[PDB]
Design a protein around this nucleic acid. Structure first.
Ligand SMILES: [Mg+2]
Ligand SMILES: [Mg+2]
Ligand SMILES: [Mg+2]
Ligand SMILES: [Mg+2]
Ligand SMILES: [Mg+2]
Ligand SMILES: [Mg+2]
Ligand SMILES: [Mg+2]
Ligand SMILES: [Mg+2]
Ligand SMILES: [Mg+2]
Ligand SMILES: [Mg+2]
Ligand SMILES: [Mg+2]
Ligand SMILES: [Mg+2]
Ligand SMILES: [Mg+2]
Ligand SMILES: [Mg+2]
Ligand SMILES: [Mg+2]
Ligand SMILES: [Mg+2]
Ligand SMILES: [Mg+2]
Ligand SMILES: [Mg+2]
Ligand SMILES: [Mg+2]
Ligand SMILES: [Mg+2]
Ligand SMILES: [Mg+2]
Ligand SMILES: [Mg+2]
Ligand SMILES: [Mg+2]
Ligand SMILES: [Mg+2]
Ligand SMILES: [Mg+2]
Ligand SMILES: [Mg+2]
Ligand SMILES: [Mg+2]
Ligand SMILES: [Mg+2]
Ligand SMILES: [Mg+2]
Ligand SMILES: [Mg+2]
Ligand SMILES: [Mg+2]
Ligand SMILES: [Mg+2]
Lengths: 384, 61, 129
RNA sequence: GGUGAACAGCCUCUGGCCAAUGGAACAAUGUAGGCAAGGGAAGUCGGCAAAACGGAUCCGUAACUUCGGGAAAAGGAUUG
RNA sequence: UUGUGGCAGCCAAGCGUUCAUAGCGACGUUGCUUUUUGAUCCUUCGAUGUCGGCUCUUCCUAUCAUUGCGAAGCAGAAUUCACCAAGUGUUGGAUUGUUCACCCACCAAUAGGGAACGUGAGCUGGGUUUAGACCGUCGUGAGACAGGUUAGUUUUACCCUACUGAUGACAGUGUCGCGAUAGUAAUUCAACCUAGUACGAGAGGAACCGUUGAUUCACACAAUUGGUCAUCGCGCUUGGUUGAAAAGCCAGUGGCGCGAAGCUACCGUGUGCCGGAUUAUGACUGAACGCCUCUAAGUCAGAAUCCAAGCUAGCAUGCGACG
């Protein structure tokens, strides 16, 4: 009664349960380990998946067939406006785990980050933090706040900053209320970390302060939703033959007689997609920082003066105006989805991590249909 | 940059796209998209499809 | 070594025999180097040295297994350049078990990834592309 | 009535009907219908099911034969 | 229960060119196993749906490869014996209903098994197992055959649970968190250099590090390629029809060509994970036992192993900060 012919499992058990993620935003379930020897910096950041394009580059990989050869690679653009720091949170180690010791919030908060605290912002009286920001126009208030910051310097071991996206500077998203999370500071002593955060309230952090080019990141988010969906599509079980009464696309035997139960590891039909996934070791090819020559999609070889956005805007996302990243390979979730960019937990030492990336051409032809021109200007000159 | 010309629609393919069909007489035909590939395989003549650059250069438009 | 290209030629495939060896036709029966998986028919691609038998050709080559090498594939496949380069007909050449070309010359164009992996098929080739 | 070899199928005229409980949504699995890249029965007990061929004109038509057939053999070309 | 089937110990006549024990081990002898078959007839005959295959899951080790080792009549290569080891893998096909069998080929390998001889309200119905029928042997005959062949209906879930997912109360409400516990995922191979080096009379002929890919699996995603069309998007077109043209419409999607968007494919693309403890084993110091000795007290190095880390869940009717 042994299996006649072995074959590896369909699907992985390391991802159960697979259900709706109870979180739209990709939560960082592990931050890079602290290193007090290094200069102080952040460890995570927020972007929005704009779309995909492709590039072509000259590979430098001694021992490869592709060495000194150009290759074409799919990339994802993540429009990634600077975060705003609106808080500073302290953590203390207890025999249970880590505790939020106490938290400090900036004097002003933007009209949209204060939307994150309501579910009906309109009919509200808009009073979130109104009586707290009065802790700053009084002498006793500032005294209390500095008392809290001293508590944070002297007791905390893990210090994190509250930061939110400016969800309004991307008109393509039909959304006004910002995404707010905690990005953990690494490096320095606790006093240095807390001084770094406090001094840096209410001011915008660029994506370069976090990441560098050629650096390896980890993109976290909730996959696309595909709905309640059959077993063959969820798990990949082979179909039953054509001539089966009561349906083909299912699992024939859902377990042996004993145990007299359906094992948890049998493939069943249920939610597919909109799962939480961390997908690690995505490489950074280019940072587009708005306002200088490195923003545009002009490489050192190609010089058609064009911006990163394709013709007719990114589908379902619109036109990219703010800063952005370009990562090799795909990105979780559909267009317009918030993603969390986290520094790697590993130690990048392999060649594939250390190649410097130098592009040759950034495809711009509209991704909506078979794009044939790079710029609307060139299409206009081609038609007349 | 180094573009190349489709041999059915005569339009410039940019790097990272194109389908090249190697006919049994050892010629190389680069189609820019699926539409050229199919009009070619279906035994149509590019000089007679009104949108093709061969048509346009034949009638001087 | 070589890169991964779309596998277009499963077992029981019938390919042209593109050399002056006498066989008009090869019949794929297995592919070298494949580690199997339940129910998957082994598939062959350009450069995949395979086992083939001649079903239509010279009687002195028929009814015996023999190594062949696929040199033309009609399944489009993704070059590293971005182009999806492919041929007009599936075609292969008879080789000795070490890979020496059995015949003398190859009729028709031949794949670059097959040539750069098999030097002697590359040498007997006439139009690499 | 038209096409068409035609009381085939498809569409219309006279006459008769819209009677089969309706509203919203387009998830899985179904019942019925399709389409698929490369390969072409490797699937399976088994080419089961589906696809393919299909009208007409012209040419050509094997073995075997009870000399009647096989035969619409097979194999080709053409069609607005 | 274990005759029988399978497995593994003890002694040592010999084989092993010398040599009992590298590797076997006859005469004997002791055990283990419940996949075979036998025995029994304890439950089930007011029915537990009976062979096989397909699917899919899980576990066992009596280990085939895979990691680490010890031994050799181990020079190298290969092969044999055993140890810690069940994490991972164990294929495509010809013929047969077949399990089994036996070939072709790949492979690192084509190990054995259990789960009511796993699995029929999951399929199939090829075999078998009603009624039709034919042949053979038997019977005087009706008929029989653990002889052969052909045709022969495969019913029900909406209940409970299990499992998969979906809401949800319980210190007002909301953001951010914590992380108990549970799941866990990566596997193997190839090529270049090392190297025609070490080893070897020669014949042949390694490996570590390093580099580049690949196989199986997993998770995503859709720029390109491909696939899909009732966008009934555009065009063409058959038959009818609105007197005609234009515009259409009907033939359940009339048909054909292209066909964006979305969905999607190892048929396309990307990514897949770092510490600690140790098993075998080999060692350190070191007695018992003036010596020796890896063990006795104490120590070390150590693996596809273990636990973490990482990834998923986190109604744990758990907890923290702030508004
Ligand atoms: Mg079975
Ligand atoms: Mg097995
Ligand atoms: Mg998938
Ligand atoms: Mg049926
Ligand atoms: Mg597109
Ligand atoms: Mg397409
Ligand atoms: Mg099979
Ligand atoms: Mg007529
Ligand atoms: Mg009629
Ligand atoms: Mg097909
Ligand atoms: Mg068949
Ligand atoms: Mg078969
Ligand atoms: Mg089979
Ligand atoms: Mg058969
Ligand atoms: Mg049929
Ligand atoms: Mg006949
Ligand atoms: Mg026994
Ligand atoms: Mg016995
Ligand atoms: Mg009884
Ligand atoms: Mg009974
Ligand atoms: Mg009963
Ligand atoms: Mg039952
Ligand atoms: Mg019953
Ligand atoms: Mg064991
Ligand atoms: Mg059952
Ligand atoms: Mg039957
Ligand atoms: Mg009968
Ligand atoms: Mg008689
Ligand atoms: Mg009988
Ligand atoms: Mg009987
Ligand atoms: Mg655990
Ligand atoms: Mg498409």
């Amino acid at each position: 009664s042994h299996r006649k012919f072995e074959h590896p499992r369909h699907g992985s058990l390391g991802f159960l349960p697979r259900k709706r993620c109870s979180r739209h935003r990709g939560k960082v379930k592990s931050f890079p380990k602290d290193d007090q020897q290094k200069p102080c910096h952040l460890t995570a950041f927020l972007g929005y998946k704009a779309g995909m394009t492709h590039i072509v580059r000259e590979v430098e990989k001694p021992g490869s067939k592709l060495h000194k050869k150009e290759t074409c690679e799919a990339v994802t653009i993540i429009e990634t406006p600077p975060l705003v720091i609106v808080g500073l949170v302290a953590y203390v180690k207890t025999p249970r785990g880590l505790r939020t010791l106490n938290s400090v919030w900036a004097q002003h908060l933007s009209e949209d980050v204060r939307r994150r605290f309501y579910k009906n912002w309109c009919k509200s009286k808009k009073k979130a933090f109104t009586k707290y920001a009065l802790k700053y126009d009084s002498d006793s208030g500032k005294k209390e706040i500095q008392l809290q910051l001293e508590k944070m310097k002297k007791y905390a071991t893990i210090v994190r900053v509250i930061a939110h996206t400016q969800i309004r500077k991307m008109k393509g998203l039909k959304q006004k209320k910002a995404h707010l999370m905690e990005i953990q500071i690494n490096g320095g002593t606790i006093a240095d970390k807390v001084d770094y955060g406090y001094k840096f309230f209410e001011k915008e952090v660029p994506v370069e302060a976090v990441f560098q080019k050629d650096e390896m990141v980890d993109i976290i988010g909730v996959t696309k939703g595909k709905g309640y969906e059959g077993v063959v599509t969820r798990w990949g079980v082979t179909r039953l033959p054509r001539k089966t009464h009561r349906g083909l696309r299912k699992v024939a035997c859902i377990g042996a007689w004993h145990p007299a139960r359906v094992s948890y590891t049998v493939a069943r039909a249920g939610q597919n997609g909109y799962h939480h996934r961390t997908e690690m070791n995505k490489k950074i090819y280019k940072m587009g920082k708005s306002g200088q020559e490195s923003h545009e999609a002009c490489t050192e070889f190609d010089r058609t003066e064009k911006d990163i956005t394709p013709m007719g805007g990114f589908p379902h996302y619109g036109v990219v105006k703010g800063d952005y990243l370009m990562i090799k390979g795909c990105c979780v979730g559909p267009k317009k989805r918030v993603v969390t960019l986290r520094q790697s937990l590993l130690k990048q030492t392999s060649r594939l991590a250390l190649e410097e990336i130098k592009l040759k051409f950034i495809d711009t032809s509209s991704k909506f249909g078979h794009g044939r021109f790079q710029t609307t200007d060139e299409k206009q000159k081609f038609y007349g | 940059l180094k573009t190349e010309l489709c041999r059915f629609s005569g339009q410039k393919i940019y790097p990272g796209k194109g389908i090249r069909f190697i006919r049994s007489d050892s010629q190389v035909f680069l189609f820019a998209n699926s539409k050229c590939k199919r009009y070619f395989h279906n035994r149509l003549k590019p000089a007679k499809l009104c949108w093709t650059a061969m048509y346009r250069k034949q009638h001087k438009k | 070594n070589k890169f991964r290209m779309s596998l277009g030629l499963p077992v029981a495939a019938t390919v042209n025999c593109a050399d002056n060896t006498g066989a008009k036709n090869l019949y794929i029966i297995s592919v070298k180097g494949i580690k199997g998986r339940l129910n998957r028919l082994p598939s062959a691609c350009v450069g995949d040295m395979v086992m083939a038998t001649v079903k239509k050709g010279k009687p002195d080559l028929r009814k015996k297994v023999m190594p062949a090498v696929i040199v033309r594939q009609r399944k489009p496949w993704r070059r590293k350049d971005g182009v999806f380069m492919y041929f007009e007909d599936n075609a292969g050449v008879i080789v000795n078990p070490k890979g020496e070309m059995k015949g003398s010359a190859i009729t028709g164009p031949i794949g670059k990834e097959c040539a750069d992996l098999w030097p002697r098929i590359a040498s007997a080739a006439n139009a690499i592309v």
